[PDB]
Design a protein around this ligand. Structure first.
Ligand SMILES: COC1=C(OC)C(=O)C(C/C=C(\C)CC/C=C(\C)CC/C=C(\C)CC/C=C(/C)CC/C=C(\C)CC/C=C(\C)CC/C=C(\C)CC/C=C(/C)CCC=C(C)C)=C(C)C1=O
Ligand SMILES: NC(=O)C1=CN([C@@H]2O[C@H](COP(=O)(O)OP(=O)(O)OC[C@H]3O[C@@H](n4cnc5c(N)ncnc54)[C@H](OP(=O)(O)O)[C@@H]3O)[C@@H](O)[C@H]2O)C=CC1
Ligand code: SF4
Ligand code: SF4
Ligand code: SF4
Lengths: 385, 54, 181, 157, 80, 316, 165, 94, 112, 324
């Protein structure tokens, strides 16, 4: 068996993907990924930051699903502080979580399509991505690394007229998905590239710690938004699509349907959005308004403390997970009572998924390896941290 | 202040999320008959053109 | 299948010598085992009908330099069958090898490689135990508390040798530690 | 030499026109900056409209965009690919990570700026720079290329 | 004559047809708008004074917000 | 260190090794370049942020020369050319610029150390025109600056050298390597890094280098045939030495010298058949026993075998 | 199963019918208007919250707003800010050095949030690519220059954004 | 007449000159896979089939029924061979 | 293949030490071609380097410390062979190829 | 014969301009499909983009890697480019507008197509890259595989015409265009041309993101340019062949005086342009097959159907005595 070394140093496949394949002709016998090419020491760096300063690091783990990791870190901190989040912030956080899910699925589906030779859908999808990135920028001033979801709520309230603009997007997005499906779903070349490729049984998915679409493709009804709900997810209607074959073609269909259900959640969040405060009112971790900091001695003192020392977290440890676009994203946070986390372990779904490439790609063709990587939806920021 | 961004009175208009069907396309037999008839008549025309060329 | 049932059921049915500590809390049920019983306890939790702990979520280390066994190895586990999570922990030092659970959960393979890379904890019967994250030829385990943030060496291109080379670090501006305590 | 200089200036202008109007960058997409660069090449900003075509091989490439954090592990692979680009070649550093290490400057595994490995012609700031910011950086690369006098310098050598 | 080699400038000249002149800045750059709805009603652009060697940084601050749809105030109204 | 060095001719072979070693010491390095901004590009990697500064200048212009020297307390000259261009003669590139640089250095007044890098064999009675002009610059810089220091390296060996690379390229194209004097000329080639180390050491001493000329040769003396043997074992190719006596060697090297100053357009540079170097191959060039060697600089040269010839792997 | 339904799929396969719709829908956008922006004559939309090039501001009298509290330096997640300060000749608490490494900065806006006098802000400018690493080491004078150049736009955004923070 | 082949030769000479100009101007400023052998074998067989079809196709007007059926028998033998290829997995690259 | 259990006693540990010495030293000809050390250092000098590292730890009596040292030795060896970072005068951690020590240090700096 | 090189250059130079503008047209059409603009800055409407790209490639330094086959590495793009050029000496654009009125023109075209594979295989082995070599082997195998179906379709047209003269093949379609009774044959021919040109959906050399390195990965400057120009000239030639064999060549759609007014060269150019548009529209519409899938299609679908159509057409023509 000869060994084919494949590292695409370009975002055709992830930029830092490196694969050592043992082949029998054009058939793969063993796929060994070499990682750490994007290992940046995030978990070590977080220990030297206050809880507020560590928040931007979570935007840069799964850099296609920014606000989702913001949400997981805030929930873990809120869990350790026993902090009550107001209802309006909960709806905003869920709304932008679902916007993030569409942003992620649009990139994952069309970069995968582009890798198997379908070049048009990427251009059609990235235009829709631009409309959604505009909503990121209008609430936070940043296209991608918003740092908008924070412990106790969100950084700022929605600008006037944003909800109407979001509603306008929802009125046409179903047609955009319909166009994406017509280019791919019924086409015989697309089916021939995806059907019966990378079959994962339910037992295999559980054994290898698979989650998200990687687990639901195998017929397992498991979604953390329903299994362990958080924020206002228990007050929203959405269906959980599951596969019947466990192949790359099933997981493609599931991501399309998840985008349709994400549209459903956004519409409900837009109509159910209540008025009220968007920060928690416990004056221990919430920054005061600019007007009170400049008028009240107590507010100025609180502002001085929050931006120099930050808030303390009582000594404890817990694991918090959310349903990120790529699967279960978890944070194991250890606090020692101080203003900096003692240990922050990040559980990345792509770490487990890419580890499953060896058994998933066994006895397939060389050209199927990229398809299987695309169906796993790998981003090496979270794999390597 | 007291004005926050949110839904209008009554909420926004309903939006569709389900896939929309589309019945565009001819029939197995229609396109078969077209091809068969074109073949027969066209090969007769080929014979006629070959006679004139000769 | 709430956290009250698991705590009460486990106390009755588990072998007594397997668990040294049991904590019930809203931060997660947590069993502290001895190193020699970690493998058997996890096999029990996975196979037993009333637990069915089929998914190993992740394995992580924690450094406690003030302890004679500085390292704590934390196993986070999930039961999709009963919709419950369980935490199992054990302690280790810089020279005590501990059992690998790859035979129980295949996903443990890379996570155990990361624990070794980041902390220096070795795993008996691990099929392929080598560093997974750090650069090749790396010295030290960076997640240890005593390991400096910026490490010991840095890389740059050296034109006379026509290659990228490693040298001891030299910072233009050192990392400033702000003591807000 | 009242007529040679006029001819030489036209030759250099023709060479600069060809090189600015046909820039074929090889994308080094290491992290989040790669996605903003993906958007720059998408319909809204259409880098193709400027003559920019992305290449998969350094052999067909004129420019290298380092978009993302460069680790010590990845550094030798970056240098090798740069050495396979045929002259004339340029490097654009995109984002704080590639510029000087950014958020991960004090880390044990991150190269503190890609200019420690390859020479850099343009630095594009931001974390990430917006897609329009990258487009501005490319237009600055065209400005530097338009200062070249390769025929004249070779004529006087 | 600049239209022949510079196709970027030609696109602006074609799209300038029928537009309304909004104002001129201190550098001579001319600001135009259409008041339509083609790219979601965004129809603001600038015709730089220098037909060659134009640069995005040549737009002054008072017109920068108008040009990027950050504000609806023109450069003239901000200066007042 | 607080040394601010203006290194002329640093965009050539020795320059890159000298700038790297000057950067290691902490010195600030100013790099005058006369053509494209691409020539000093590889030097920007050396040294920390802002320590190496390329600066455009003009050899035939004194206002530009004093512009790049105006902030320096150390000046090092590496400017020289082994062949002739229709614009720069041997005296123009190897003597006129060197003497011009010293006079501006004299006009400056703030130059603690001045080093002029010449060549081993630079003498008045030399068959080669380039070495004759070097010796003139030797005397001119000494007359203009008697406190200046001179180095006389032998043929330098390195990745970008013009002896082993032209031969290997010639062999892989024609299959045989010519010998110009029957492979009998003696000389002692030196590692390029050692030459750079010597210049740094002279800058780093307590002042004992000033006014003295150093002959820097390799540890061992070869003949041209023997050196040509080293590369053959390195490029793993079959040795096919074809002899060539001097008359015909000056025959095929005659055209470029003949037509350089007549045609109005540039010509390719000579590799093996450079009439001027062929003349210098007639007599053995060696470090004199009475001069100052690498010893008295407290440095030992590297042997050629091994690392100094590692760049020949690319030719296999 | 049935000779008609067998005939149905046989003709659909042979005549590549499902690839006809793929061609049809690829052609519809061909005659439609394009979404490409004519940069640099036309620009993409931005909000008053946009986090771009940093700037130091002054009061309308010309006095610096910054009072060297060092809150921005303490909160900066990238340690991109370096400050030195002492009492001025008139007794004022002012900085003698204010440096922002634009290559360490992650453009988070935390410094703007921490500042109690609205001295440091992230302006709307995003077109400041440079040819050298050195020019991205901003000093105090450069930041005050940026504030002078962008003051009219910054003040307008601050007025619009004052109702939210 | 072979007279129409001379312009082709001059065309080849000119095309070679253009190619050399284009390619010369820039110089101024251990695994055996049996399936490739097998695809070569099949290509060789069917290439000879196309060869024997050209005289037949231009000559159908004079050979009439006899030549048609002789070609049919030729094809029958070669198609028996092709069916043998199909059934033995020579046409499958999986 | 897999990581073995900790050695029970010093006989087991020292037996593991010799297998590592054999395996590490048998790979010197591979290392010589990888770093092109033919004209740089003799194979025996690198053999004596490995032996010297083993001897410098001959005082260790805990078998668990010996097991960890061998495991780190195998990893150091594997990175040298599989992923070589060729410097000139070093491989990995090892250099290849009339006054006391106070004045030399004193002339250098104030930090000893 | 003194005027022959003038005609030869009047063929070759406009062909090179047409190739340079076919690349621009493909970029413009793919862009318009994708709601973008494509080249529009370098010249009015991007019309100077091909000139800039060619001039850029001319000025780019040639690498010529340290291989042991330097002559073959450089000769490989020259071989494929000369082959792409020489096919146009026998192509007629109108009655009497053809350089060489070969009586064996059909077989000459088949010979050129068979020769095309050598540039690709020599590039792979001479490039000293395992990845380039395995890609070149796959591309060569695909090309020879679809040559069989191309040849069998050519035989079908030959049976209808009874002469290898391309002008006679056109003039045989005066009564009716062969694309009407042989429409499935025309579809098979267009797909076989796509696969023979290494074009989408059959563009293995463009499948770099598929871990499939092309045969020309080690080529830079004008060797790469020659490979590209050869492939696009072949695309134009395949469009011309589809026009000549099935769409009546220079003939008008209907034999009426109103159609007969405009020159036959315009008719021929219009039809060639329609097929060149299809090459791009298909590239923009579909994903690509794996190598094994397209090889299966070549040997298991297109060969049997081509052989069946040869048999059916010949049998029907000899049965009713409708032979030429
Ligand atoms: C992205 O894909 C693409 C390519 O390859 C990847 C291309 O090469 C190209 C462009 C390549 C070309 C236009 C090559 C054109 C070359 C010709 C038309 C023949 C020569 C034309 C010239 C203007 C050069 C003249 C050269 C001389 C020495 C003058 C002699 C008279 C494009 C546009 C492209 O999109
Ligand atoms: N074998 C050898 O290389 C030996 C060399 N020496 C001498 O040492 C010195 C440095 O050697 P090396 O680095 O190899 O030389 P190179 O020829 O490789 O480099 C010469 C340098 O001087 C510059 N230069 C040359 N001619 C002129 C000119 N007419 N006007 C302005 N600048 C000019 C070049 O700039 P640019 O690149 O822009 O042309 C370049 O930076 C030379 O004087 C050389 O003769 C000593 C003994 C042996
Ligand atoms: S600069 Fe910011 S956005 Fe770009 S790669 Fe680094 S962290 Fe990600
Ligand atoms: S934007 Fe963030 S990283 Fe940059 S200076 Fe301000 S606080 Fe520091
Ligand atoms: S900019 Fe603001 S926060 Fe920073 S030191 Fe000045 S006053 Fe304090």
């Amino acid at each position: 068996n000869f060994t084919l070394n494949f590292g695409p140093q370009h975002p055709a496949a992830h930029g830092v993907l490196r694969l050592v394949l043992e082949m029998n002709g054009e058939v793969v016998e063993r796929a060994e990924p070499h990682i750490g090419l994007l290992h940046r020491g995030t978990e070590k760096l977080i220990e030297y930051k206050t809880y507020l300063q560590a928040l931007p690091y979570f935007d840069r783990l799964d850099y296609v699903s920014m606000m989702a990791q913001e949400h997981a870190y805030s929930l873990a901190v809120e869990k350790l502080l026993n902090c009550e989040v107001p209802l309006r912030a909960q709806y905003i956080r869920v709304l932008f979580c679902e916007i993030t899910r569409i942003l992620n699925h649009l990139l994952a589906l069309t970069t995968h399509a582009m890798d198997v030779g379908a070049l048009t859908p990427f251009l059609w999808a990235f235009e829709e991505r631009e409309k959604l990135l505009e909503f990121y920028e209008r609430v936070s001033g940043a296209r991608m690394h918003a740092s908008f979801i924070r412990p106790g709520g969100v950084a700022q309230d929605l600008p006037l007229g944003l909800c109407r603009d979001i509603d306008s997007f929802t009125q046409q997005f179903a047609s955009r998905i319909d166009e994406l499906e017509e280019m791919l779903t019924g086409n015989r070349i697309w089916k021939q590239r995806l059907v019966d490729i990378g079959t994962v049984t339910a037992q295999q998915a559980k054994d290898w710690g698979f989650s998200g679409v990687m687990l639901r493709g195998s017929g397992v009804c498991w979604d953390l938004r329903r299994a362990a709900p958080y924020d206002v997810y228990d007050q929203l209607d959405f269906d959980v699509p599951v596969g019947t074959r466990g192949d790359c073609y099933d997981r493609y269909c599931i991501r399309i349907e998840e985008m349709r259900q994400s549209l459903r959640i956004i519409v409900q969040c837009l109509n159910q959005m209540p008025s009220g405060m968007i920060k928690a009112d416990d004056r221990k971790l919430c920054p005061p308004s600019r007007c009170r900091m400049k008028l009240s001695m107590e507010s100025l003192i609180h502002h001085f403390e929050l931006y120099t020392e930050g808030f303390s977290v009582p000594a404890s440890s817990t694991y918090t997970a959310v349903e990120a676009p790529k699967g279960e994203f978890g944070v194991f946070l250890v606090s020692n009572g101080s203003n900096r986390p003692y240990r922050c372990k990040i559980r990345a779904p792509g770490f487990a998924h890419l580890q499953g490439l060896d058994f998933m790609s066994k006895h397939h063709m060389l050209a199927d390896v990229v398809t299987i990587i695309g169906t796993q939806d790998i981003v090496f920021g979270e794999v390597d941290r | 202040p007291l004005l926050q961004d949110g839904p209008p009175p009554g909420g926004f208009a309903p939006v569709r999320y389900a896939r929309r069907i589309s019945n565009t396309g001819p029939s197995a037999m229609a396109m078969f008959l077209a091809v068969s008839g074109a073949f027969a008549w066209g090969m007769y025309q080929v014979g006629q053109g070959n006679k004139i060329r000769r | 299948m709430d956290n009250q049932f698991i705590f009460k059921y486990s106390w009755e049915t588990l072998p007594k010598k397997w668990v040294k500590k049991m904590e019930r809390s809203e931060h997660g049920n947590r069993f502290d085992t001895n190193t020699d019983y970690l493998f058997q306890l996890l096999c029990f939790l996975k196979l037993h009908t009333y637990t069915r702990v089929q998914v190993l979520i992740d394995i992580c280390g924690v450094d406690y330099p003030s302890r004679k066994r500085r390292f704590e190895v934390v196993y986070n586990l999930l039961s999709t069958r009963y919709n419950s999570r369980i935490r199992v922990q054990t302690s280790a030092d810089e020279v005590t090898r501990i059992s690998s659970v790859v035979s129980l959960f295949p996903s443990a393979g890379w996570w155990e490689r990361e624990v070794w890379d980041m902390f220096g904890v070795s795993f008996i019967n691990h099929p392929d135990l080598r560093r997974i994250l750090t650069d090749y030829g790396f010295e030290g385990h960076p997640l240890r508390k005593d390991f400096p943030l910026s490490g010991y060496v840095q890389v740059r291109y050296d034109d006379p040798e026509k290659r990228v080379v490693s040298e001891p670090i030299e910072m233009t501006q050192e990392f400033r530690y702000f003591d807000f305590a | 030499s009242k007529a040679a200089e006029f001819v030489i200036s036209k030759v250099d202008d023709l060479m600069n026109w060809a090189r600015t109007g046909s820039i074929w960058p090889m994308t080094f997409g290491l992290a989040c900056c790669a996605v903003e660069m993906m958007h720059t090449g998408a319909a809204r900003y259409d880098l193709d409209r400027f003559g920019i075509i992305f290449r998969p091989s350094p052999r067909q490439s004129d420019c290298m965009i380092v978009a993302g954090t460069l680790t010590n592990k990845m550094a030798p692979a970056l240098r090798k690919v740069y050495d396979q680009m045929p002259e004339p070649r340029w490097v654009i550093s995109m984002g704080s990570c590639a510029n000087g290490g950014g958020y991960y400057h004090y880390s044990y595994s991150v190269v503190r700026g890609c200019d420690r490995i390859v020479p850099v012609d343009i630095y594009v700031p931001g974390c990430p720079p917006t897609a329009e910011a990258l487009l501005y950086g490319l237009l600055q690369l065209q400005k530097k290329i338009n200062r070249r006098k390769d025929f004249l310098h070779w004529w006087n050598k | 004559m600049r239209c022949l080699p510079d196709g970027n400038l030609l696109q602006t000249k074609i799209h300038n047809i029928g537009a309304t002149l909004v104002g001129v800045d201190k550098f001579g750059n001319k600001y135009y708008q259409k008041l339509g709805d083609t790219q979601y009603g965004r129809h603001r652009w600038v015709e730089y004074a220098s037909k060659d060697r134009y640069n995005a940084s040549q737009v002054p601050a008072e017109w920068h917000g108008w040009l990027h749809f950050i504000t609806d105030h023109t450069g003239d109204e901000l200066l007042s | 260190s607080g040394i601010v060095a203006t290194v002329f001719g640093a965009t050539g072979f020795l320059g890159r090794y000298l700038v790297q070693q000057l950067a290691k010491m902490g010195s600030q390095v100013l790099v005058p370049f006369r053509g494209s901004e691409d020539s000093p590009r590889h030097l920007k990697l050396m040294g920390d942020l802002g320590q190496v500064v390329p600066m455009k200048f003009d050899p035939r212009d004194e206002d530009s020369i004093k512009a790049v020297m105006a902030k320096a307390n150390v000046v090092i000259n590496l400017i020289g050319r082994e062949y002739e261009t229709r614009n720069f003669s041997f005296e123009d590139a190897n003597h006129h610029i060197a003497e011009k640089l010293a006079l501006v250095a004299k006009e400056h007044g703030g130059i603690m150390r001045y080093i002029q890098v010449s060549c081993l064999g630079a003498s008045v009675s030399s068959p080669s025109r380039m070495l004759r002009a070097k010796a003139a610059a030797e005397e001119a810089v000494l007359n203009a600056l008697p406190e200046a220091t001179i180095m006389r390296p032998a043929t330098m060996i390195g990745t970008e050298d013009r002896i082993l690379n032209p031969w290997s390229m010639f062999v892989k194209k024609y299959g045989f390597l010519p010998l110009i004097g029957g492979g009998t000329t003696k000389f002692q080639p030196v590692y390029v890094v050692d030459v750079a180390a010597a210049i740094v050491a002279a800058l780093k001493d307590d002042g004992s280098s000033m006014g003295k000329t150093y002959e820097l040769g390799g540890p061992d003396v070869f003949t041209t045939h023997e050196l040509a043997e080293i590369m053959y074992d390195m490029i793993r190719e079959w040795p096919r030495y074809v002899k060539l006596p001097f008359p015909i060697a000056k025959a095929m090297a005659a055209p470029r010298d003949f037509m350089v100053n007549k045609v109005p357009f540039p010509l390719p540079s000579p590799q093996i058949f450079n009439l001027d170097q062929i003349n210098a191959l007639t007599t053995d060039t060696l470090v004199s026993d009475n001069a100052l060697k690498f010893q008295d600089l407290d440095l030992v040269p590297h042997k050629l075998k091994g690392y100094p010839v590692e760049f020949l792997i690319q030719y296999r | 199963k049935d000779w008609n339904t067998v005939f149905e799929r046989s003709i659909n396969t042979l005549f590549l019918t499902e690839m006809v719709r793929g061609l049809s829908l690829t052609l519809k956008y061909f005659f439609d208007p394009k979404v490409t922006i004519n940069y640099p004559f036309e620009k993409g939309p931005l909000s008053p919250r946009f986090r771009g090039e940093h700037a130091l501001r002054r009061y309308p009298t010309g006095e610096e707003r910054c009072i060297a509290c060092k809150l921005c330096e303490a909160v900066c997640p990238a340690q991109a800010i370096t400050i030195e300060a002492e009492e001025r000749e008139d007794g004022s608490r002012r900085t003698t050095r204010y440096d922002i490494d634009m290559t360490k900065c992650i453009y988070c806006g935390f410094c703007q949030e921490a500042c109690p006098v609205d001295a440091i802000v992230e302006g709307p400018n995003f077109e400041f690519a440079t040819e050298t690493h050195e020019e991205l080491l901003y000093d105090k004078e450069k930041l005050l220059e940026n504030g002078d150049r962008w003051e009219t736009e910054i003040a307008e955004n601050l007025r619009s954004e004052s109702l939210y923070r | 007449m072979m007279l129409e082949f001379a312009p082709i030769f001059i065309y080849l000479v000119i095309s070679l000159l253009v190619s050399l100009i284009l390619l010369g101007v820039p110089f101024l400023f251990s695994r055996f896979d049996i399936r490739f052998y097998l695809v070569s074998i099949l290509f060789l067989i069917f290439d000879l089939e196309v060869t024997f079809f050209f005289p037949w196709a231009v000559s159908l007007n004079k050979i009439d029924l006899f030549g048609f059926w002789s070609m049919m028998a030729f094809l029958f033998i070669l198609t028996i061979g092709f069916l043998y290829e199909w059934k033995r997995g020579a046409l499958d690259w999986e | 293949i897999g990581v073995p259990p900790n050695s029970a006693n010093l006989t087991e540990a020292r037996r593991r030490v010799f297998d590592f010495f054999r395996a590490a030293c048998r790979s010197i000809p591979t290392i010589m071609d990888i770093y092109n050390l033919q004209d740089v250092v003799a194979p025996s000098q690198l053999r004596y380097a490995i032996s010297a590292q083993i001897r410098n730890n001959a005082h260790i009596t805990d078998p668990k410390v010996i097991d960890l040292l061998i495991f780190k030795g195998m990893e150091e060896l594997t990175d040298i062979v599989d992923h070589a970072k060729q410097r000139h005068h070093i491989i990995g951690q090892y250099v290849v190829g009339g006054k006391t020590d106070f004045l030399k240090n004193f002339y250098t700096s104030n930090y000893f | 014969y003194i005027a022959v090189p003038a005609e030869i250059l009047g063929i070759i130079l406009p062909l090179l301009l047409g190739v340079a503008f076919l690349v621009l047209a493909e970029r413009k059409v793919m862009a318009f499909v994708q709601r973008r603009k494509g080249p529009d800055v370098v010249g009015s409407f991007g019309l100077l983009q091909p000139l800039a790209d060619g001039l850029k490639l001319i000025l780019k330094e040639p690498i010529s890697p340290s291989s042991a086959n330097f002559f073959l590495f450089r000769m490989a793009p020259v071989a494929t480019f000369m082959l792409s050029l020489v096919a146009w000496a026998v192509v007629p654009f109108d009655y009497g507008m053809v350089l060489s009125d070969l009586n064996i023109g059909l077989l000459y075209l088949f010979a050129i197509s068979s020769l095309g594979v050598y540039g690709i295989i020599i590039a792979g082995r001479s490039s000293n890259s395992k990845y380039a070599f395995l890609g070149a082997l796959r591309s060569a195998a695909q090309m020879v595989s679809y040559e069989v179906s191309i040849g069998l379709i050519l035989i079908t047209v030959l049976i209808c015409v009874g002469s290898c003269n391309l002008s006679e093949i056109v003039m045989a379609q005066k009564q009716i265009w062969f694309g009407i009774p042989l429409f499935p044959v025309l579809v098979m021919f267009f797909i076989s041309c796509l696969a023979e040109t290494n074009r989408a959906p059959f563009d293995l050399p463009e499948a770099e993101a598929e871990l499939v390195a092309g045969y020309n990965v080690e080529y830079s400057s004008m060797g790469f340019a020659l490979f590209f120009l050869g492939e696009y000239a072949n695309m134009i030639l395949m469009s011309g062949l589809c026009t000549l064999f099935f769409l009546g060549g220079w003939l008008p759609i209907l034999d009426l005086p109103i159609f007969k007014k405009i020159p036959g060269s315009i008719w021929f150019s219009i039809k060639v342009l329609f097929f060149l548009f299809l090459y791009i529209w298909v590239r923009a519409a579909f994903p690509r097959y794996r190598y094994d899938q397209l090889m299966g299609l070549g040997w298991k679908v297109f060969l049997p159907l081509s052989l069946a159509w040869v048999v059916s057409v010949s049998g029907l023509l000899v049965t009713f005595q409708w032979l030429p």
